Design a protein around this nucleic acid. Structure first.
Ligand SMILES: C[S@@+](CC[C@H](N)C(=O)[O-])C[C@H]1O[C@@H](n2cnc3c(N)ncnc32)[C@H](O)[C@@H]1O
Lengths: 167, 96, 99, 108, 86, 105, 96, 79, 98
DNA sequence: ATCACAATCCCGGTGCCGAGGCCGCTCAATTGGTCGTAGACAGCTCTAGCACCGCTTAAACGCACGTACGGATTCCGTACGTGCGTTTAAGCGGTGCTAGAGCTGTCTACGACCAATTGAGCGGCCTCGGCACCGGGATTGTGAT
DNA sequence: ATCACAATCCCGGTGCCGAGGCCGCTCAATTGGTCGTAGACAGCTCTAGCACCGCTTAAACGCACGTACGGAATCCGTACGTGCGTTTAAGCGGTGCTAGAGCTGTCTACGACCAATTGAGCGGCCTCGGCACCGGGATTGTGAT
């Protein structure tokens, strides 16, 4: 029976995982979720199928921009109250960058609400030096739960406008 | 007469015939494999003894043999060795 | 009157002297708490840590990084440099047997 | 009496469960040794032996040879990252080293 | 408005903290690429010790990672720590 | 001279070291002189570190040993440093040394 | 209430310090570090003595096993002086 | 005088197995000193093991035990 | 006539000795060195042939690993020649040297 | 690009010794039944780990600047590598010996085990000096004048 | 060189709290004795480690020569250290909550242990094929055109 145990090295498992994750990045295969209305929150994401920890949930897609245009567009959204704040900063290697999702499209990572006791977290994914911000489940999630994460704004002035800490 | 030494020669040879039926092993390589088996046995058993002493347990069970295996061997080796050990202990229990 | 500014390096020497004279932990406590809990959440969910446990982790980590940085400084001086570069850390860890 | 079926055959192992149990008892590791502890340890030893021997046989067949020599064991251990980590502070006699030259040394 | 940005706990080991750690090692001058690099190495070190530590907690059937578990995990890696036993 | 430590002229507990050897799973029997010898070695090493620690405390004009003094004592003596080469002492710091190439010219 | 018994080398390290430096004290952290050092060296020497007993097929730890373990572990003058003072202690113990 | 028995070409061969392309002229004495230090450190432990066994012969088991005490375990000699 | 450029024979020799497992130090000089060293510790000592062979195995493995670390140190210094300072740095990083 | 050219690689025969298989035994692994105790499990306590809220502020962060330094280039001399011929000593093979390793057999001192005694060492408490913090004066390394 | 001048060292004042010393208990070290057996030792066997010797090449060594490279000097760009001003989140402290760490009790099933048995493994022996060496054409980096 030539019994030869199959043991993937710790050099192919992450390789077989990086390409198993990025195949939802360059593609828009955003399955397993639905759009719903949540009281006080408006549009939100509901999981229609079971999610385990480490399972990819949804990519936060948008225009990848620099900080110099970032600040100008942030001022623009500050001037117009009805535009909203869909923009989201991050850091990569030795430089800061950002993603703009204010333009209303079919991308569904932008429509996710906020919670400090949520079930998902945002992580970076590098593809040929291109960052992509992906929301991934932090724990086992059954179908029907609302997808939530931490907006990463524990600022004094941000809480003044949007004081939804918990519950 | 006498001069009897305990070794893992035949067992390493049998597992070799299972994994590579058409190949053999030299005396020096068999000695190295025996030394490897002795070293790993001593390492895992010492870690299991330390585990038992830490938790004030005077018995080495399968649980701290498993814990010692997880402590010593790196990641994927630890997972697959734990799988094999649990499979073997299940088969042994299902044949009392 | 031109304001006073120290030549580059002497403040670094003073920091070296003060931080080698002292024994206080150099990494902030609460960020280390958070990093330990976040990095331990991949191994067992809903864990708890004794305060002394994170204390021991912080002391161990600190000591490890200080020894690593001493080896890195030696590897930098070997390369006829004063700056420590990432390649110096890579060489130190390769020689130490970690990589 | 009943037929003696040993304990390696009970667990489907080639390594001696009884001998491992005897070594654990005589190794003075603890006051008592569980029944499943030698079975688990023998299974782990058999798995590690199987991995080492599989990679060594692959290395030997790569070198157009049908007998495993210490060089093949060394190549198997040092080529597999995990086994190299396990046997990092282990010297294999008559094993040599991996063939590798730093890129800077090669002529341009 | 707002300052929406992801926070990750590895950045809690700040650039000045790394600078202090290097000063205690006797480093005058530090490349800017050290920080991320050493951040990574710290993570690696932690990923080892805590894993061993949590394995100990898993064996004792405890939900709390005790100081003694970390001491055991460090002693396993040839990094024995004094002053936390008992 | 009821206690074995008093009999051996030692301050470390010969009886406690004997009990620890018996309960530590080292061999099924432990000799009579083994705990005495090991206790003597342990108290010798303790005295050797504590003398240098007290010297470090005097050099720091402190009358109490702290982890810093123990670290200085261990790393200053080459043989103690070799014995404790793979340990890190909590709150001990490091030896004060700046490389000569680093010092300004 | 009435927490359990805990064994430590605190009082003996204190007596040794008072014998060496009669006017110098020791802090709780430094005392804990001394306790950890004593435990570590005891464990190391006892493990080496157990290894010596198992290597030579002897089932007992004698003063000679501990002497050889000390010679193996402690380097340089430390081994010489530790061996001398342990031999002095065993001689005095056997005399009385 | 036996330390010079580890000849210059032997040091060159050892460096070649380590992947060294060019070897300085002062490497040989430094390597002889390093080998002497390592051999003294191992041999002291080995002779300690023989003394404890009350043997006048340094066996292979004693040598591999000395190596293992230093974290340099050797496979293929009865360990 | 014919003469190889310096370095190429060195690369050929590196490949040759990294392909083989044979001991590189001559056995009798190493055995005499071992006996001279052991004379310091205990006089009139006999050595098993397997004991000297184990010592040679360990010594050559240690020297080869040390020379690999030395080569890494030399390359780190933008060099190709290994120098005694490279050995000293490798040993200090490994923790053997003070 | 083109050339010859030593070094390497490959294919085939041969011996030859080390690996692979078989036989008898013996010693250990197996089977079975007892005992007692280590451990699993249930329950209780109370410790401490988690989580929050407010405020202070030490420290991290962000920015401008200049300078010390990392790095590329160039060149010089020497100190390496490579090849030659000569010396030497490693190595193989054989012989002799004897010191010491290994085993056996007696048995005697030595260590585990047990009953009982008690005092050394534990915890709990108090208390006061070493020490940390602080303020001020004097002294000092540093860098521009 | 002289002098601000920021930094550090040194002199107490004083409060804090933790190290140290005392007292109660209690349980673990001691004492004395019994018994089994571990290894100390005496003697025998016989293995292999040492010592020597004699060729025989493989290997080391000494020298020549030149070429690459180590190292020093120079110049340039940049990036990091230094300081300053803003922010931020670390930390302290104070308060609750309850999860689970630790302890206690019970009861049990699991492993040590003993005795008898037999079969698997090991020493011993044979035999035989794969690997190492030799020997000739295929090849392939390599250094000079
Ligand atoms: C990433 S956008 C979400 C998209 C948009 N709010 C919607 O529902 O279509 C963030 C905005 O949603 C609002 N928001 C986020 N989390 C919320 C919550 N938990 N409850 C109410 N509003 C929330 C904030 O005011 C913020 O401006």
């Amino acid at each position: 029976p030539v019994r030869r145990s199959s043991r993937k090295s710790k050099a192919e498992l992450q390789s077989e995982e990086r390409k198993r994750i990025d195949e939802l990045i360059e593609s828009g295969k955003e399955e397993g979720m639905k759009i719903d209305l949540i009281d006080g929150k408006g549009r939100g994401v509901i999981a229609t199928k079971q999610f385990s920890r480490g399972d990819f949930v949804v990519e936060y897609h948008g225009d990848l921009i620099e900080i110099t245009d970032a600040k100008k567009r942030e001022a623009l959204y500050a001037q117009d109250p009805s535009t909203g704040c869909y923009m989201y900063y991050f850091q990569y290697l030795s430089k800061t960058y950002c993603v703009d999702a204010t333009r209303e499209t079919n991308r569904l990572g932008r429509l996710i609400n906020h919670s400090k006791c949520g079930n998902c977290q945002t992580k970076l994914h590098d593809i040929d030096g291109v960052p992509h911000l992906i929301l991934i489940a932090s724990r086992d999630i059954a179908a029907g739960e609302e997808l939530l994460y931490d907006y990463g704004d524990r600022s004094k002035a941000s809480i003044e406008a949007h004081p939804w800490l918990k519950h | 007469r006498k001069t009897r030494k305990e070794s893992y020669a035949i067992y390493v040879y049998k597992v070799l015939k299972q994994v590579h039926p058409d190949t053999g092993i030299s005396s020096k390589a068999m000695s190295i494999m025996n030394s490897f088996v002795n070293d790993v046995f001593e390492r895992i058993a010492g870690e299991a003894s330390r585990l038992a002493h830490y938790n004030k347990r005077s018995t080495i069970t399968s649980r701290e043999i498993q814990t010692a295996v997880r402590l010593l061997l790196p990641g994927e080796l630890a997972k697959h060795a734990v799988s094999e050990g649990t499979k073997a202990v299940t088969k042994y229990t299902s044949a009392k | 009157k031109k304001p006073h500014r120290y030549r580059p390096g002497t403040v670094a020497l003073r920091e070296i002297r003060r931080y080698q004279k002292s024994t206080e932990l150099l990494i902030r406590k609460l960020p280390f708490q958070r990093l330990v809990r976040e990095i331990a959440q991949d191994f067992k969910t809903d864990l708890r840590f004794q305060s002394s446990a994170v204390m021991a982790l912080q002391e161990a980590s600190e000591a490890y990084l200080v020894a690593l940085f001493e080896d890195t400084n030696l590897c930098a001086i070997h390369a006829k440099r004063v700056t420590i570069m990432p390649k110096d850390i890579q060489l130190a860890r390769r020689i130490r047997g970690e990589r | 009496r009943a037929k003696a079926k040993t304990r390696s055959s009970r667990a489907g192992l080639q390594f001696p469960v009884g001998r491992v149990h005897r070594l654990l008892r005589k190794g003075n590791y603890a006051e008592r040794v569980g029944a499943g502890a030698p079975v688990y340890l023998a299974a782990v030893l058999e798995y590690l032996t199987a991995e080492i021997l599989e990679l060594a046989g692959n290395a030997a067949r790569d070198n157009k040879k049908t007998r495993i020599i210490p060089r093949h064991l060394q190549l198997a251990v040092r080529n597999d990252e995990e086994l190299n980590k396990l046997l990092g502070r282990v010297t294999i006699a008559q094993g040599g080293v991996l063939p590798n030259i730093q890129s800077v040394l090669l002529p341009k | 408005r707002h300052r929406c940005v992801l926070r990750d706990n590895i950045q809690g080991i700040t650039k000045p903290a790394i600078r202090r750690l290097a000063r205690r090692g006797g480093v005058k001058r530090i490349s800017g690429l050290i920080y991320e690099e050493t951040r990574g190495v710290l993570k690696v070190f932690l990923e080892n010790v805590i894993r061993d530590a949590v394995t100990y907690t898993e064996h004792a059937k405890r939900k709390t990672v005790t100081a003694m578990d970390v001491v055991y995990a460090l002693k396993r890696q040839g990094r024995t720590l004094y002053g936390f036993g008992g």
